[PDB]
Amino acid sequence: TQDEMKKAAGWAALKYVEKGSIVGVGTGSTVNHFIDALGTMSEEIKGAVSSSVASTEKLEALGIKIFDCNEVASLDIYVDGADEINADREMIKGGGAALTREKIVAAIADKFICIVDGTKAVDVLGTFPLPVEVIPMARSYVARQLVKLGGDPCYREGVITDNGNVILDVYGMKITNPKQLEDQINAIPGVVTVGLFAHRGADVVITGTPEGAKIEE
Amino acid sequence: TQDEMKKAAGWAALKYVEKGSIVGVGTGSTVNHFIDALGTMSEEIKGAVSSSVASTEKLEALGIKIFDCNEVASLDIYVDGADEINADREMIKGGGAALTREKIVAAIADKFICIVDGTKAVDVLGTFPLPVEVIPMARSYVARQLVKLGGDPCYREGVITDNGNVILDVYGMKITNPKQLEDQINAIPGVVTVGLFAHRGADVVITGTPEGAKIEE
Numbered sequence A, B: 001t002q003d004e005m006k007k008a009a010g011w012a013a014l015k016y017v018e019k020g021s022i023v024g025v026g027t028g029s030t031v032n033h034f035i036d037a038l039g040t041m042s043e044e045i046k047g048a049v050s051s052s053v054a055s056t057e058k059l060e061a062l063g064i065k066i067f068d069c070n071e072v073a074s075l076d077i078y079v080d081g082a083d084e085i086n087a088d089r090e091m092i093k094g095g096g097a098a099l100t101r102e103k104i105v106a107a108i109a110d111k112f113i114c115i116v117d118g119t120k121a122v123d124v125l126g127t128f129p130l131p132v133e134v135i136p137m138a139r140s141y142v143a144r145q146l147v148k149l150g151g152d153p154c155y156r157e158g159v160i161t162d163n164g165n166v167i168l169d170v171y172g173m174k175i176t177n178p179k180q181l182e183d184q185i186n187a188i189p190g191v192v193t194v195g196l197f198a199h200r201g202a203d204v205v206i207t208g209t210p211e212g213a214k215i216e217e
């Protein structure tokens, strides 16, 4: 879409931010606009936890104390974009970010504010490929089992996660039953994390549309 | 129960391997003895996959070609033991060995052959601690989720797996639906693997008795 639309929705996520708390912050262009909002709130919060390398650096551009996940028993909210989001507020995430890091911070937070532009909502999940983080020794075997589920897994060659794991991006599933899909893949030895955000979806969906932020809750 | 029982047991699995093929090898007192068996008919064996450093190196000094999981579609068999195994042939594995490679080598293998001493048959799994491998940034999270499930998880402090993750050994559990708890465990974000082989269990169960080994095909 446009960055003026990303902007709005990012700015709208600041409403949900409780005076004097540690804030869960994801990564990305829409997310960076939210961070600007928070910079207007550096003194009236405790800190911030981040699932992003770049996000951590910007939070430390406004003087916000970072915590790591092992330091808090909970977050109030975690604000992040998505790659694809359905009417059921289940997401495909982690296509261009730290999948594992994002799912952990997300499961630990109380509310999950999804801030998006016009182009993230889909009818059915799956055209945007599903990222699957895997133990390298299990890649082939996990690839076979995904072909078994109706996908076309593609080895994201050239890279590894910080964990030192590989990524299979799975093209060409029509993901009608996302809670059940995440069980199946979750069920596969070798599999570290699947980017299906279906069991813990968005609690609020804050979209940015040619006429402002529109919030769903 | 005894180191001769182990040895009668790991030798008795020897009858399960064939010519020109590739063997799955675990680790443990009792597989050693099977590794001790495997050498004698090394010439007819294409070579081996294993899930353990010690076995690998012992098979190597034997002139047994090692393969990796990325080279194969399948393995006729996996010989390994267990920490616990129930009447339903479900096992607690990886208190003692490399949880992730075992669960992975077992998944590529058609037939799992559990070689065991008097100490391994339980009726209800859970006395021997249940290993769960966990991305470190998630350790307390996954641990709060483990409590909910009637669990007392205990960080195995001072060590990590080859990839940099921690271990949580869960005590106090009465595990009567294993496939369920595995389901549930594979399902916390930050979990990497769980020491429940419940979906995929022991096909053959090889114990140690006083004279020969009881076997159960």
Ligand SMILES: O=P(O)(O)OCC1OC(O)C(O)C1O
Binding pocket: A028, A029, A030, A096
């Ligand atoms: O050339 P590209 O793919 O548009 O790269 C720039 C951007 O990368 C992103 O994740 C963006 O949201 C974005 O605008």
Ligand SMILES: O=P(O)(O)OCC1OC(O)C(O)C1O
Binding pocket: B027, B028, B029, B030, B031, B081, B082, B083, B096, B119, B128
């Ligand atoms: O009695 P524990 O504490 O389970 O440890 C002994 C052993 O457990 C195993 O799986 C073995 O192969 C083995 O020798």
